[PDB]
């Protein structure tokens, strides 16, 4: 297995390549690549040029057209010795796109040929300096059969084109912007193309082109609209304009991730492009908006300024995720977006930070870089950027962005460079703050308060600590922006002050323990703590149920109201899981049910907020409330809680469900909010009197005039195991079996079903007409959903879930390591479960560990999980 690489070993390259001219003689079985690079030595004169290469058939090596004899091929490299200070390197090699099942480098997607080069896929195309601090100007000539590949695309603009004998043709592209090879892209195939235009604020007219498989034009307008929305927003919010003449996006069916920001030629998983009202849900529309925007935002945060090395991945991913969240939030509901992102942080990222794979947002050790496009690097990375925004304020934050681009435009930078730019532009000291980049694990912030009537002072005693993680035995206090707000008994905000001077609501929690005193607090306050999730930490405060219901009705920020409800539910989710383990039924105080009844009947509350408060935490969110996870107890308690609320709020739920009916379907935020609330109510109504529920659900499925409402009904039928379930599921299959993206929703429902025979059903679906092990989307929607989204079934006491996953991973380890690595994650969490389960999970991991040709992707995770 390959050795681990460490951030502290970074060293500038001995050679730089300033320009590269590529020529591809394209063919699915045998592609011939000719690469002419202009190299310049920067290191010692006796240093050899070390080129990275994987699975390449070397044809020849020339230096200034002279056949070179001073070279040697070694594991993953071509080492060239005795070179001039400046020279022209010419490499000719062959590759086989059709044989590329890992989908890394140049591969085949259906009948099209396309690429994926990040993190290190370009080395699978030709021998090169496959490191992001080497920026070269690319020129790409593509030669191919005209009938099979009428469209030949690469980064930049077309500078040449011609016809050849034997029905072949070629096109040459030039991208003026120097770039690391991970941003290189090539696409060849036959597509339908949606063309539009966007005029920047300064007048630059940009040609927009969206390439989709023939017959998919009816699902392309929303993505195009989202691209234009993204371009406009970046101008308005960040003052950034697109910098090229054309913007191409190609939607492909076979892609390991969601999308890729290749300069001027983004390549997208079709899941994040294709949408029409009968195939896509409101969520799909908003996800397409998010991803289209995300990759577009990389044009500046990632492309114009790239990464010095891969340990600096968060420099572009954390910042770009922050940007896509601000984009979504500005255009839609900021409260809903913040709530959703906090659910991801608390329910998924915290779990990772408490797992064997824990790492700082800026990793120190990496074996397989593809294993580091994580919730930590992305989501926590964004939370760190957001904390900088919280500490600086929008104005100074933008000044920091401006200085960052001024200093690093056209180069590869580091996380430290970014922080320095923010510090220098704002004059805000971020020296202590920097620890957020080096320390893994989730900080735990404990708060104790006291109200002194004699002095009319409110005191907060705040403590912090980060438990040790398997990767770091030493932990230190962080600079935690801790936002608060105090309310009097009328729900009015109490001015924060001390010694006659106002105090900022964002407290600087920088020590292991500290006190914060506020005077002129005339009456005992109810505090709102860690407002808007001001820092990615776990809050420990002894809330009374009344303080929480008070906040649910009076908190100024909608997020606080949702957050208070989560704290209220946590107490009873924990209470009932303990009861479940002792064979006792659900117990819930009347005043708790009343709090949710109040939310339903509050006419002043935003439907968007009400919908989220009425959406119970997922089983994965619930799992984080426990030291030792009991997946079956959690799943059954979640259903029991749903049933109890459905019974206690039956009339109110139906009233709100009916009140939010909308005849017209619009992908507009106000409409989406009402529909989300209506369907939130439907989830509960599905657990009402069987016949009543069955009729209501089947009715919505059949009368729905959009996929959002149809899927909501189908999901409810499956969740409540209603009589109509089998009929509706078969009807969906018969109508959509030919559409993979649509069937993925169906596979997810089958995989996350509460039915006793779910595994048997999932295994059988491996033979379904709409499923195929060759497609990452299908794999993740069926197998991934089962293992990661149905922990109750995956963790069946008999161990059947683990055995099934081992079978699937034995296949995927050889076929597609990246997808295999995404799928093994559930097994890596073994220490969070009981002894019996740990034993079975360890056995499963040991079996995988002994696999012939074990991929580095899995090796890295298996090793840490078995430690
Ligand atoms: C909206 C985005 C956060 C979705 C996300 N895509 C990205 O982050 C891209 O900008 C990544 N740069 C693409 C990528 C992902 C994984 C490994 C190598 C390369 C993805 O999941 O593909
Ligand atoms: Zn990204």
Swiss-Prot record:
The record marks 378 as: Transition state stabilizer. It catalyses: Release of an N-terminal amino acid, Xaa-|-Yaa- from a peptide, amide or arylamide. Xaa is preferably Ala, but may be most amino acids including Pro (slow action). When a terminal hydrophobic residue is followed by a prolyl residue, the two may be released as an intact Xaa-Pro dipeptide. It comes from the Bacteria. Substrate binds at residues 118, 258-262. Zn(2+) binds at residues 294, 298, 317. InterPro entries: Aminopeptidase_N-like_N, Aminopeptidase_N-like_N_sf, PepN_Ig-like_sf, Peptidase_M1, Peptidase_M1_dom, Peptidase_M1_pepN, Peptidase_M1_pepN_C, Peptidase_M1_pepN_C_sf. It is a peripheral membrane protein. Signal peptide: none annotated. Its cofactor is Zn(2+). GO terms for molecular function: alanyl aminopeptidase activity; aminopeptidase activity; identical protein binding; metallopeptidase activity; zinc ion binding. The active site is at residue 295. CDD domains: M1_APN (cd09600). Keywords: Aminopeptidase, Cell inner membrane, Cell membrane, Hydrolase, Membrane, Metal-binding, Metalloprotease, Protease, Zinc. One of its GO terms (cellular component) is plasma membrane. Its EC number is 3.4.11.2. Disruption phenotype: A quadruple peptidase disruption (pepA, pepB, pepD and pepN) does not grow in M9 minimal medium, does grow better when supplemented with casamino acids. The keyword Membrane applies. One of its GO terms (biological process) is proteolysis. It is found in: Cell inner membrane. Binds 1 zinc ion per subunit. Aminopeptidase N is involved in the degradation of intracellular peptides generated by protein breakdown during normal growth as well as in response to nutrient starvation. Belongs to the peptidase M1 family. This is Aminopeptidase N. It comes from Escherichia coli (strain K12). The gene is pepN.
């Amino acid at each position: 297995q390959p050795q681990a690489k460490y951030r502290h070993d970074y060293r500038a390259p001995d050679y730089q390549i300033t320009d590269i001219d590529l020529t591809f003689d394209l063919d699915a079985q045998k592609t011939v690549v000719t690469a002419v690079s202009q190299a310049v030595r920067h290191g010692a004169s006796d240093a050899p040029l070390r080129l990275n290469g994987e699975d390449l058939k070397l044809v020849s090596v020339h230096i200034n057209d002279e056949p070179w004899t001073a070279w040697k091929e070694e594991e993953g490299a071509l080492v060239i010795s005795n070179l001039p200070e400046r020279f022209t390197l010419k490499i000719i090699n062959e590759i086989s796109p059709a044989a590329n099942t890992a989908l890394e480098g140049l591969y085949q997607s259906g009948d099209a040929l396309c690429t994926q080069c990040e993190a290190e896929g370009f080395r699978h195309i030709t021998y090169y300096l496959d490191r992001p601090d080497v920026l070269a100007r690319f020129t790409t000539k593509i030669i191919a059969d005209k009938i099979k590949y009428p469209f030949l695309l690469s980064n930049g603009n077309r500078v040449a084109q011609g016809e050849l004998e034997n029905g072949r043709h070629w096109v040459q592209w030039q991208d003026p912007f120097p770039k690391p090879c991970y941003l290189f892209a090539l696409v060849a195939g036959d597509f339908d193309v949606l063309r539009d235009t966007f005029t920047t604020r300064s007048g630059r007219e940009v040609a927009l082109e969206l390439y989709v498989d023939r017959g998919n034009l009816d699902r392309a307008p929303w993505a195009m609209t989202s691209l234009k929305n993204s371009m406009k927003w970046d101008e308005e919010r960040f003052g950034l304009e697109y910098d090229l003449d054309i913007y191409m996006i190609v939607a492909v069916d076979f892609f390991n991730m969601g999308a890729m920001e290749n300069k001027g030629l983004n390549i997208f998983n079709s899941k994040y492009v294709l949408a029409r009202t009968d195939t896509a849900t409101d969520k799909d529309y908003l996800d397409i908006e998010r991803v289209i925007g995300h990759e577009y935002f990389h044009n500046w945060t990632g492309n114009r300024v790239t990464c010095r090395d891969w340990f600096q991945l968060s420099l572009k991913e954390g910042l770009t995720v922050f940007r896509d969240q601000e984009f979504s939030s500005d255009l839609g509901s900021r409260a809903v977006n913040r709530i959703n992102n906090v659910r991801t942080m608390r329910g998924l990222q915290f779990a990772e930070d408490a797992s064997p794979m824990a790492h700082p947002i800026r990793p120190d050790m990496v074996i397989e870089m593809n294993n580091f496009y994580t919730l930590t690097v992305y989501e926590k990375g964004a939370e760190v950027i957001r904390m900088i925004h919280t500490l600086l304020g929008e104005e100074n934050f933008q000044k920091g962005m401006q200085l960052y681009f001024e200093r690093h435009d056209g180069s590869a930078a580091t996380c430290d460079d970014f922080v320095q730019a923010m510090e220098d532009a704002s004059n805000v000291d971020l020296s202590h703050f920097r620890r957020w980049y080096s320390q893994s694990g989730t900080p735990i912030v404990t708060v104790k308060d006291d109200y002194n009537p004699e002095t009319e002072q409110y005191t907060l005693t705040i403590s912090q600590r980060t438990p040790a993680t398997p990767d770091q035995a030493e932990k230190q206090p962080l600079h935690i922006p801790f936002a608060i707000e105090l309310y009097d008994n009328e729900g009015k905000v109490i001015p924060l002050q001390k010694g006659g001077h106002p105090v900022n609501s964002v407290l600087n929690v920088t020590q292991a323990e500290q006190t914060f005193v506020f005077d002129n607090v005339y009456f005992q306050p109810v505090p709102a703590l860690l407002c808007e999730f001001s820092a990615p930490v776990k809050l420990e405060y002894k809330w009374s149920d009344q303080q929480l219901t008070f906040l649910m009705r009076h908190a100024r920020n909608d997020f606080s109201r949702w957050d208070a409800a989560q704290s209220l539910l946590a107490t009873y989710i924990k209470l009932n899981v303990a009861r479940h383990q002792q064979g006792q039924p659900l117990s819930l105080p009347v005043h708790v049910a009343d709090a949710f009844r109040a939310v339903l009947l509050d006419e002043k509350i935003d439907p968007a907020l009400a919908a989220e408060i009425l959406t119970l935490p997922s089983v994965n969110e619930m799992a984080e409330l426990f030291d030792i996870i009991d997946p079956i107890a959690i799943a059954e308690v979640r259903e029991a809680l749903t049933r109890t609320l459905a019974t206690e709020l039956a009339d109110e739920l139906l009233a709100i469900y009916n009140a939010n009916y909308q005849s017209e379907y619009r992908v507009e935020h106000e409409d989406i909010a009402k529909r989300t609330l209506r369907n939130a109510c439907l989830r509960f109504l599905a657990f009402g009197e069987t016949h009543l529920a069955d009729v209501l659900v089947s009715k919505q499925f059949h009368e729905a005039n959009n996929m959002t409402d149809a899927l909501a009904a189908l999901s409810a039928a499956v969740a409540a195991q209603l009589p109509c379930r089998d009929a509706l599921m078969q009807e969906y299959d018969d109508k959509w079996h030919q559409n993979g993206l649509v069937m993925d929703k169906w596979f997810i429902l089958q995989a996350t079903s509460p039915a006793a025979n779910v595994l048997e059903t999932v295994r059988g679906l491996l033979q379904h007409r709409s499923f195929t092990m060759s497609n990452p989307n299908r794999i993740r929607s069926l197998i991934g959903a089962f293992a990661g989204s149905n922990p109750a079934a995956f963790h069946a006491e008999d161990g059947s879930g683990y055995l099934f996953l081992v079978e699937m991973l034995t296949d995927l380890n050889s076929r597609n390591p990246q997808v295999a690595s995404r799928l093994i994650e559930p097994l890596i969490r073994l220490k969070r479960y009981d002894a019996k389960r740990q034993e079975k999970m360890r056995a499963a991991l040991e079996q995988l560990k002994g696999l012939e040709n074990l991929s580095g992707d899995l090796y890295e995770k298996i090793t840490k999980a078995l430690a």
